[PDB]
């Protein structure tokens, strides 16, 4: 097993699946049909966090709004969503709320009707315009690069969420700023060890 | 004598001796360290 040298890997994880480093200490994927669903579910999680982590960091580096401040314009009656400074001419709460439900539910239900298991996770066609999946050897290389970047993104999202939990209101980049103030005092040590 | 040592090992006899010893021990701990509510 690569994920923990000297540890025997589960017998159903042989390293062929992209990102199969033999990690499954609870043996969740011992039921083969669950393993395949879990493969699909992991990629879906990976691709969302890979979109979100830029979305959480890029606007904080730029104009006002850490990923939590970008959401406090709703809730309280009023509604004045601003994209890149300009208040978008439709950024009221019920407008995007319906648009989000209708658009996301439609494309998510469409995803669920695919019967083929390999197209459930690697559909291709329109979503592979540049033909990156044409080469079978190169196809599998990008499969691993996808899952590894996606697991890193999921890991970053957890940090973002857990950091927010510890320093409410702050943003992840402000956390890094506060860290670089004096790294030997502004650490997770304060969180793990109060005062 | 070996018959007597067998009898002294019978369930009731071994029990009183065991529990007598136990009671003496607990009584003396309570005479030396009385009124212990914590620990």
């Amino acid at each position: 097993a690569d994920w923990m040298p000297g540890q025997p890997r589960p017998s159903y994880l042989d390293g062929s699946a992209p990102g199969d480093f033999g990690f499954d200490p609870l043996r969740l994927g011992e039921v083969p049909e669950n393993l395949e669903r879990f493969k699909e579910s992991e990629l879906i999680h990976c691709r969302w966090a890979m979109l979100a982590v830029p979305g959480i960091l890029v606007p904080e580096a730029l104009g006002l709004g850490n990923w939590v401040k970008a959401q406090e314009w709703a809730a309280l009656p009023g509604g004045q969503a601003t994209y890149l400074g300009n208040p978008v001419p439709w950024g009221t709460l019920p407008t995007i709320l319906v648009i989000e439900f209708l658009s996301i539910a439609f494309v998510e239900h469409q995803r669920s009707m695919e019967k083929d298991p390999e197209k459930k996770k690697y559909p291709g066609g329109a979503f592979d315009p540049l033909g990156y999946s044409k080469d079978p050897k190169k196809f599998h290389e990008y499969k691993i690069k996808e899952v590894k970047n996606g697991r890193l993104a999921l890991l970053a999202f957890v940090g973002i969420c857990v950091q927010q939990s510890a320093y409410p209101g702050t943003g992840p980049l402000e956390n890094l700023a506060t860290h670089l103030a004096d790294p030997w005092h502004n650490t997770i040590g304060n969180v793990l060890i109060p005062a | 004598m070996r018959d007597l040592k067998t009898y002294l090992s019978v369930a009731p006899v071994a029990s009183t001796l065991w529990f007598a010893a136990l009671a003496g021990l607990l009584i003396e701990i309570n005479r030396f360290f009385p009124d212990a509510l914590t620990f």
């Binding site: 209708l102 239900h109 009707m113 | -």
Partner: protein, 95 residues
Amino acid sequence: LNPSLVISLSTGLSLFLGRFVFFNFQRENVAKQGLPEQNGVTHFEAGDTRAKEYVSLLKSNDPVGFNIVDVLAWGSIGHIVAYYILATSSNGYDP
């Protein structure tokens, strides 16, 4: 908020969803777990004469078979979503 606009937009979308986007899935699942059975046999087949499926109502000349029960079902969800939006906007709740 215009009530007629909210109600008829909600019902419109719900009816649209049930006819064009969710129809196959709902039909597939009804076929999957079909009529209720007692001891391996439908209630009607067991003698519950009052348990006869009303094929007359279920008939429809709609291309996909969207019938009057579908209109009642998806039309009900629309009215429920509509009146949730209307009542929720009628108050001045602050979280």
